[PDB]
Structure formats: structure tokens, C-alpha cells
Amino acid sequence: GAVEV
Amino acid sequence: GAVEV
Amino acid sequence: GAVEV
Amino acid sequence: GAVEV
Amino acid sequence: GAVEV
Amino acid sequence: GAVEV
Amino acid sequence: GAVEV
Amino acid sequence: GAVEV
Amino acid sequence: GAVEV
Amino acid sequence: GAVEV
Amino acid sequence: GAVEV
Amino acid sequence: GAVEV
Amino acid sequence: GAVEV
Amino acid sequence: GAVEV
Amino acid sequence: GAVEV
Amino acid sequence: GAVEV
Amino acid sequence: GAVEV
Amino acid sequence: GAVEV
Amino acid sequence: GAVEV
Amino acid sequence: GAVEV
Numbered sequence: 001g002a003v004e005v
Numbered sequence: 006g007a008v009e010v
Numbered sequence: 011g012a013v014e015v
Numbered sequence: 016g017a018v019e020v
Numbered sequence: 021g022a023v024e025v
Numbered sequence: 026g027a028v029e030v
Numbered sequence: 031g032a033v034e035v
Numbered sequence: 036g037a038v039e040v
Numbered sequence: 041g042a043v044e045v
Numbered sequence: 046g047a048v049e050v
Numbered sequence: 051g052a053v054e055v
Numbered sequence: 056g057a058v059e060v
Numbered sequence: 061g062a063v064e065v
Numbered sequence: 066g067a068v069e070v
Numbered sequence: 071g072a073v074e075v
Numbered sequence: 076g077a078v079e080v
Numbered sequence: 081g082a083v084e085v
Numbered sequence: 086g087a088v089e090v
Numbered sequence: 091g092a093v094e095v
Numbered sequence: 096g097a098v099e100v
């Protein structure tokens with residue numbers, strides 16, 4: 001899981 | 006699961 | 011998981 | 016996991 | 021894990 | 026892990 | 031781990 | 036680990 | 041580990 | 046470890 | 051504190 | 056604190 | 061403190 | 066302190 | 071202190 | 076102190 | 081002190 | 086003191 | 091003192 | 096004193 005901002 | 010903002 | 015900003 | 020900024 | 025900036 | 030800037 | 035700048 | 040600048 | 045500058 | 050400059 | 055996301 | 060998302 | 065993301 | 070990311 | 075990333 | 080990254 | 085990276 | 090890297 | 095690297 | 100590397 002990649003979190004953006 | 007990727008979270009955006 | 012890569013986090014951006 | 017690579018973190019950007 | 022490589023961290024950028 | 027290599028850190029850039 | 032190599033650190034740049 | 037080699038550090039640059 | 042070699043340090044440059 | 047060799048240090049340059 | 052207030053948070054706006 | 057207040058939050059607006 | 062306030063946070064805006 | 067305030068943080069904006 | 072304030073942080074902007 | 077303030078930090079901007 | 082302030083830091084900008 | 087201030088640091089910019 | 092200030093440092094810029 | 097200031098240092099720039």
C-alpha cells in the first residue's frame with residue numbers, strides 16, 4: 001500500500 | 006490499499 | 011509500500 | 016518501501 | 021528502502 | 026537503503 | 031547504504 | 036556505505 | 041566507506 | 046575508507 | 051489544532 | 056480542533 | 061499546531 | 066508548530 | 071517550528 | 076526553527 | 081536555526 | 086545556525 | 091554558524 | 096563560522 005500526500 | 010490525500 | 015509527499 | 020519527499 | 025528528499 | 030538529499 | 035547530499 | 040557531499 | 045566532499 | 050576532499 | 055486534508 | 060476532509 | 065495535507 | 070505536506 | 075514537506 | 080524539505 | 085533540504 | 090542541504 | 095552542503 | 100561543503 002502506497003500512500004500519496 | 007493505497008490512500009490518496 | 012512507498013509513501014509520496 | 017521508498018519514501019519520496 | 022531509499023528515501024528521496 | 027540509499028538516502029538522496 | 032550510500033547517502034547523497 | 037559511501038557518502039557523497 | 042569512502043566519503044566524497 | 047578513503048576520504049576525498 | 052485544526053487539520054484540513 | 057476542527058477537521059475538514 | 062495546524063496541519064494541511 | 067504547523068505542518069503542510 | 072513549522073515544517074512544509 | 077523551521078524546516079522545509 | 082532553520083533547515084531546508 | 087541555518088543549514089541547507 | 092551556517093552550513094550549506 | 097560558516098561551512099560550505
Ligand SMILES: *C(=O)Cc1ccc(-c2ccc(-c3ccc(CC(*)=O)cc3)s2)cc1
Pocket residue numbers: 001002006011
Ligand atoms: C499485530 O497484531 C501484529 C502485526 C502488525 C502488523 C502486521 C503487518 C504485516 C504487513 C503489513 C502491511 C501491509 C500493507 C502495507 C501497505 C502496502 O504495502 C503496509 C504494511 S502490516 C502484521 C502483524
Ligand SMILES: *C(=O)Cc1ccc(-c2ccc(-c3ccc(CC(*)=O)cc3)s2)cc1
Pocket residue numbers: 001006007
Ligand atoms: C490483529 O488482530 C492482528 C493483525 C493486524 C493486521 C493484519 C493485516 C494484514 C494485512 C493488512 C493490510 C491490508 C491492506 C492494506 C492496504 C493495501 O495494501 C494494508 C494492510 S492488515 C493482520 C493481523
Ligand SMILES: *C(=O)Cc1ccc(-c2ccc(-c3ccc(CC(*)=O)cc3)s2)cc1
Pocket residue numbers: 001011012016
Ligand atoms: C508488531 O506486532 C511487530 C511487527 C511490526 C512490524 C512488522 C512489519 C513487517 C513488514 C512491514 C512493512 C510492510 C510494508 C511496508 C511498506 C512497503 O513496503 C513497510 C513495512 S511492518 C511485523 C511485526
Ligand SMILES: *C(=O)Cc1ccc(-c2ccc(-c3ccc(CC(*)=O)cc3)s2)cc1
Pocket residue numbers: 011016017021
Ligand atoms: C517490533 O516488534 C520489532 C520489529 C521492528 C521492525 C521490523 C521490520 C522489518 C522490516 C521492516 C521494513 C519494511 C519495509 C520498509 C520500506 C521498504 O523497504 C522498511 C522497513 S520493519 C520487524 C520487527
Ligand SMILES: *C(=O)Cc1ccc(-c2ccc(-c3ccc(CC(*)=O)cc3)s2)cc1
Pocket residue numbers: 016021022026
Ligand atoms: C526492534 O525491535 C529491533 C529491530 C530494529 C530494526 C530492525 C530492522 C531490520 C532491517 C531494517 C530496514 C529495512 C528497510 C530499510 C530501507 C531499505 O532498505 C531500512 C532498514 S530495520 C530489526 C529489528
Ligand SMILES: *C(=O)Cc1ccc(-c2ccc(-c3ccc(CC(*)=O)cc3)s2)cc1
Pocket residue numbers: 021026027031
Ligand atoms: C535494535 O534493536 C538493534 C538493531 C539496530 C539496527 C539494526 C540494523 C541492521 C541493518 C540496518 C540497516 C538496513 C538498511 C539500511 C539502508 C540500506 O542499506 C541501513 C541500515 S539497521 C539491527 C538491530
Ligand SMILES: *C(=O)Cc1ccc(-c2ccc(-c3ccc(CC(*)=O)cc3)s2)cc1
Pocket residue numbers: 026031032036
Ligand atoms: C544497536 O543495538 C547496536 C548496533 C548498531 C548498529 C548496527 C549496524 C550494522 C550495520 C549497519 C549499517 C547498515 C547499512 C549502512 C548503509 C549502507 O551500507 C550503514 C550501516 S548498522 C548493529 C548493531
Ligand SMILES: *C(=O)Cc1ccc(-c2ccc(-c3ccc(CC(*)=O)cc3)s2)cc1
Pocket residue numbers: 031036037041
Ligand atoms: C553499538 O552498539 C556498537 C557498534 C557500533 C558500530 C558498529 C558498526 C559496524 C559496521 C558499521 C558500518 C557499516 C556501513 C558503513 C558505510 C559503508 O560501509 C559504515 C560503518 S557500524 C557495530 C557495533
Ligand SMILES: *C(=O)Cc1ccc(-c2ccc(-c3ccc(CC(*)=O)cc3)s2)cc1
Pocket residue numbers: 036041042046
Ligand atoms: C563502539 O561500540 C565500538 C566500535 C566502534 C567502531 C567500530 C567500527 C568498525 C569498523 C568501522 C567502519 C566501517 C566502515 C567504514 C567506511 C568504509 O570502510 C569506516 C569504519 S567502525 C566497531 C566498534
Ligand SMILES: *C(=O)Cc1ccc(-c2ccc(-c3ccc(CC(*)=O)cc3)s2)cc1
Pocket residue numbers: 041046047
Ligand atoms: C572504540 O570503541 C574503540 C575502537 C575505535 C576504532 C576502531 C577502528 C578499527 C578500524 C577502523 C577504520 C575502518 C575504516 C577506515 C576507513 C578505510 O579504511 C578507517 C578506520 S576504526 C576500533 C575500536
Ligand SMILES: *C(=O)Cc1ccc(-c2ccc(-c3ccc(CC(*)=O)cc3)s2)cc1
Pocket residue numbers: 051052056061062
Ligand atoms: C497536565 O495537565 C499535563 C498537560 C497535558 C496536556 C495539556 C494540553 C492542553 C491543551 C493542549 C493543546 C492542544 C491542541 C493545540 C493545537 C490545537 O488547538 C494546542 C494545545 S496540550 C496541558 C497539560
Ligand SMILES: *C(=O)Cc1ccc(-c2ccc(-c3ccc(CC(*)=O)cc3)s2)cc1
Pocket residue numbers: 051052053056061062063
Ligand atoms: C499527556 O499529556 C499525553 C498527551 C500527549 C499529547 C497531547 C497533544 C496535545 C496537542 C496535540 C495535537 C494538536 C494538533 C495536531 C494537528 C492534527 O490535526 C496534532 C496534535 S496532541 C495531549 C496529551
Ligand SMILES: *C(=O)Cc1ccc(-c2ccc(-c3ccc(CC(*)=O)cc3)s2)cc1
Pocket residue numbers: 051052056057
Ligand atoms: C488532566 O486533566 C490532564 C489533561 C488532559 C487533557 C486536557 C485537554 C483539554 C482540552 C484539550 C484540547 C483539545 C482540542 C484542542 C483543539 C480543538 O479544539 C485543543 C485543546 S487537551 C487537559 C489536561
Ligand SMILES: *C(=O)Cc1ccc(-c2ccc(-c3ccc(CC(*)=O)cc3)s2)cc1
Pocket residue numbers: 051052053056057058
Ligand atoms: C490523556 O490526556 C490522553 C489524551 C491525549 C490526547 C488528547 C488530545 C487533545 C487534543 C487532541 C486533538 C485535537 C484536534 C485534532 C485534529 C483532528 O481533527 C487532533 C487531536 S487529542 C486528549 C487526551
Ligand SMILES: *C(=O)Cc1ccc(-c2ccc(-c3ccc(CC(*)=O)cc3)s2)cc1
Pocket residue numbers: 051061062066067
Ligand atoms: C506539564 O504540564 C508539562 C506540559 C506538557 C505539555 C504542555 C503543552 C501545552 C500546549 C502545548 C502546545 C501544543 C501545540 C502547539 C502548536 C499548535 O497549537 C503549541 C504548544 S505543549 C505544557 C506543559
Ligand SMILES: *C(=O)Cc1ccc(-c2ccc(-c3ccc(CC(*)=O)cc3)s2)cc1
Pocket residue numbers: 051061062063066067068
Ligand atoms: C508530555 O508532555 C507528553 C507530550 C509530548 C508532546 C506534546 C506535544 C505538544 C505539541 C505537539 C505538536 C503540535 C503540532 C504538531 C504539528 C502537527 O500537525 C505536532 C506536534 S505534541 C504533548 C505532550
